Design an enzyme around this catalytic site. Structure first.
Site, PDB file in Angstrom:
ATOM      1  CG  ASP A 279      -1.792   1.223   1.298  1.00 46.17           C
ATOM      2  OD1 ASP A 279      -1.879   1.944   0.282  1.00 46.17           O
ATOM      3  OD2 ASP A 279      -2.419   1.424   2.367  1.00 46.17           O
TER       4      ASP A 279
ATOM      5  CB  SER B 206      -1.902  14.290 -13.531  1.00 43.47           C
ATOM      6  OG  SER B 206      -2.293  14.048 -14.860  1.00 43.47           O
TER       7      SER B 206
END
Length: 330
Positions: free
Chosen positions: A35, A199
């Site tokens: 994770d 992004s």
């Protein structure tokens, strides 16, 4: 040193991935959920409340000659999905794919919430975010990666998650045969303890690319892709009959649909998520309403590049003095 381990989807939807991990002496092998959005290595154990164990493999520290109670240490964690676990702490030897850390904090669960009990395939979590998020008190502990870093050939690990197929976690090296083209690296903020990056925009299907900054985290422990409501609405508007359902808890779409791809930007490069990766199947057994793999982050507080996005790429988690993320197509 290096390590290399196969990671395998837990079910036919790729809801999560499990990777075998050796703990203790002799080894006890548990299948852990790696994770990159959390920083605790915790396991089902001989200390877990018996009624909260339902099929998981447990760690028994008393059977490990290298286990040592970390006196006074406790841990307690709550995840974004509302699940939680807590317990005490041992140190022990932990190996992943041939890479061994001695003295790793292994957090032994005394209590787990219902979603953990109900998932017999996940024996615990191995956190790979920054150690500043580790919950052990009163002495915070380091992640497996942080402990291994100095020994690794290169201070990196990589995630290569499969679509409906096994993939690989590598530690200490970049397998140049595992991706196509070049790796594009992008800046990371560690201020929130996550692999947080920006992004450069998105496209829906064959549509034109929209240049826009989207801050979010690379999170192997989250199944879906959570993005701003504007972006998610633009995606689902291209699917006939798709709608946001408050009763289901997100966007659903007709199971008869063919979904468009979704592209996200990494600097000037582009990662394409095929439409099929966005199909999470019937909302309930036999339903013709299917659950979408791109959902709004509006209720979260952060955008999450979960498995839906990451499994479309070869992803480098670069733990150099100034960390960065790398993405390549594959």
């Amino acid at each position: 040193s290096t390590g290399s381990a196969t990671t395998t989807p837990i079910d036919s939807l790729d809801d999560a991935y499990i990777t075998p991990v050796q703990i203790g002496t002799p080894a006890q092998t548990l299948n852990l959920d790696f994770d990159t959005g959390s920083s605790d290595l915790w396991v089902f154990s001989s200390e877990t409340t018996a009624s909260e164990v339902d099929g998981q493999t447990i760690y028994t520290p008393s059977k490990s000659t290298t286990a040592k109670l970390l006196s006074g240490a406790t841990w307690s964690i709550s995840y974004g999905d509302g699940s939680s676990s807590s317990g005490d702490v041992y140190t022990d030897t932990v190996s992943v794919g041939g890479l061994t850390v001695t003295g790793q904090a292994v957090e032994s669960a005394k209590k787990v919430s219902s979603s953990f009990t109900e998932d017999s395939t996940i024996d615990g979590l191995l956190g790979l975010a920054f150690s500043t998020l580790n919950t052990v008190s009163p002495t915070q502990q380091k992640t497996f990666f942080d402990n291994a870093k100095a020994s690794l050939d290169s201070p990196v690990f990589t995630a290569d998650l499969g679509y409906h197929a096994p993939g690989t976690y590598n530690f200490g090296f970049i397998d140049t045969t595992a991706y196509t083209g070049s790796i594009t690296y992008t800046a990371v903020s560690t201020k929130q303890g996550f692999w947080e990056w920006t992004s450069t925009g998105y496209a829906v299907g064959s549509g034109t690319f929209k240049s826009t900054s989207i801050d979010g985290i690379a999170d192997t422990g989250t199944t879906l892709l959570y993005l701003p409501a504007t972006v998610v609405s633009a995606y689902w508007a291209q699917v006939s009959g798709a709608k946001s359902s408050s009763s289901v808890g997100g966007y659903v779409f007709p199971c008869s649909a063919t979904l468009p791809s979704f592209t996200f930007g990494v600097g000037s490069a582009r990662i394409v998520i095929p439409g099929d990766y966005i199909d999470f199947g019937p909302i309930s057994t036999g339903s013709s309403s299917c659950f979408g793999g791109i959902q709004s982050s509006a209720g979260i507080g952060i955008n999450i590049f979960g498995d839906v996005a990451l499994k479309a790429a070869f992803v480098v988690f670069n733990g150099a003095t100034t960390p960065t993320l790398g993405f390549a197509s594959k």
